Design a protein around this ligand. Structure first.
Ligand code: VZM
Length: 163
């Protein structure tokens, strides 16, 4: 079974009227939920406006994020994977032979790409062996950076969030 941390979505922006039960009924549409909690004040029991769900598999997490925007009890919520919410990554170790279509063909299966920037030397124009990819949405980056490995154009690349 995949580590539970990778099966969790933190849900921000909840309606204060959302409950464990109503959050579960909503998010069960996209997979089996092993956990579903609305965070509440320990004294007043008033909702703190966020919670989390835990799916049985990572593919269910994917399915849930692909079904965004989620309107839950009348309010659009903000689901994010557990870990810095950015849309850009640094891709290192691609050397001089890696081109734009290599990066695009690989990274477009993580999300919609808006910019690919292959870095070149300011003086010579030679490729410097790293690039930046900007996506239209943060979940692409979140999926990317929790992988142990990235292989592009035969290279094992180092990939991290970029600000
Ligand atoms: C380790 O990642 C975490 C851990 C705790 C948290 N707490 C939160 O407030 N969760 C969120 C609400 C909406 C989106 S993120 C977030 N991310």
């Amino acid at each position: 079974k995949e580590p539970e941390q990778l099966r969790k979505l933190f849900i921000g922006g909840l309606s204060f009227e959302t409950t464990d039960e109503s959050l579960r009924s909503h998010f069960e549409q996209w997979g089996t939920l092993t956990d579903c909690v609305v965070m509440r004040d320990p004294n007043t029991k008033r909702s703190r406006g966020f919670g989390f769900v835990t799916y049985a598999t990572v593919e269910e997490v994917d399915a849930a994020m692909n079904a965004r925007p989620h309107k839950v009890d009348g309010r659009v919520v903000e689901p994010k994977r557990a870990v810095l919410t950015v849309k850009k990554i640094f891709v290192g170790g691609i050397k001089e032979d890696t081109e734009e279509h290599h990066l695009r063909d690989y990274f477009e299966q993580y999300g919609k790409i808006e910019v690919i920037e292959i870095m070149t030397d300011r003086g010579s124009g030679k490729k410097r062996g790293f690039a930046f990819v900007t996506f239209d949405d943060h979940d692409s980056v979140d999926k990317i950076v929790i992988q142990k490995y990235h292989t592009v154009n035969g290279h094992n690349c180092e990939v991290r969030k970029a600000l």
